[PDB]
Amino acid sequence: NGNQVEIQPRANIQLDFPELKPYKQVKQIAPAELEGLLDLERVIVVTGFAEVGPWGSARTRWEMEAFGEFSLEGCVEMAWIMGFISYHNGNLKGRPYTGWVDSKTKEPVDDKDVKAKYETSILEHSGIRLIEPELFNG
């Protein structure tokens, strides 16, 4: 007699702003008498936070802390932080390319392949580990 397309995930890193409920539910949580009782100039709130640490940013550190391993967005962020991957937009070996390339070899890297390519080295060079003299002036 003679002669399905599959879709690969691409990392979509989010900022993770707090979810805001409808006024009805949020009104249900706190006493009804609280409305107009507080001087909101005297209430201090945290509107942003960040960190630089052994597990990267606050996003990647939290992934490691809460779940013990990196999602795709976490793996891509750790790879980019550690300089394993870099973004490219232009001609690569003649053909145009838009996406991640390995920082050293400049070969294209798909998001799905970041874990397989790099995760083991990311985990080996993150968190509590043997002191690396190159990071502390020998």
Added chain:
Amino acid sequence: GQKGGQAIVVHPDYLYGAITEDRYNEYVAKVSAREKSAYKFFHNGMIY
């Protein structure tokens, strides 16, 4: 050096009980717009 400290952080949703519905809704709209701009900036800044 005897430096002891404590902080208490409360869930942000308790704040909203202190304001009216109109103020809350206008805040929500403003935050949503700001978050979209922040995403745009974050990804541009990351890749470049």
Added chain:
Amino acid sequence: MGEPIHKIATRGVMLWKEFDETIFNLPKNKLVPTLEAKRDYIISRLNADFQKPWFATVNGQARDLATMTYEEVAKRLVELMFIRSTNSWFDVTWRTFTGDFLRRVEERFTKSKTLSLIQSYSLLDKPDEAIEKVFNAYPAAREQFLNAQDIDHFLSMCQNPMQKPVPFVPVLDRRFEIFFKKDSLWQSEHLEAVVDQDVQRTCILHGPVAAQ
């Protein structure tokens, strides 16, 4: 390339002449600052008086690719490349362009290996239903601006040689002249593929003396 052409003085051609003497004759080191200074005026002129409008225009509000949602981009592509009168895409390479964009949308907003919801681009012969399907599967794409990488991908595939040039201006940069001028002659015979079927937006070659 700078060769004179005799064209009917339509609003599109008048804009062409204005840009010829105001933007395209500028030296390289001045082109980008001028485009940046005149972005609003240029965008308004494109949307009002030219056959290749500003792409990032949502419901008449000028924008940028970075300030559009994925859904807004998909709908704009369908609005500018799909002819309602003939119920067809003006050409199949624009169909392929829109299908490529929807596949990228799925790739961006999917969490694991999955079957594409656009198995054959022939499903785009009813673009509304295909768009509804894609963005019902990935509702988060209706309220998130394009990832910067997807902006770059979109502009890359606006520059695909094996593809009919896109009927819009997607960005203001060093290649604005190419975006503005390339493939300007077919619109005279296919007004059904122009924004308002408006001849005044198109360029029609005609001799001055022979016109009499």
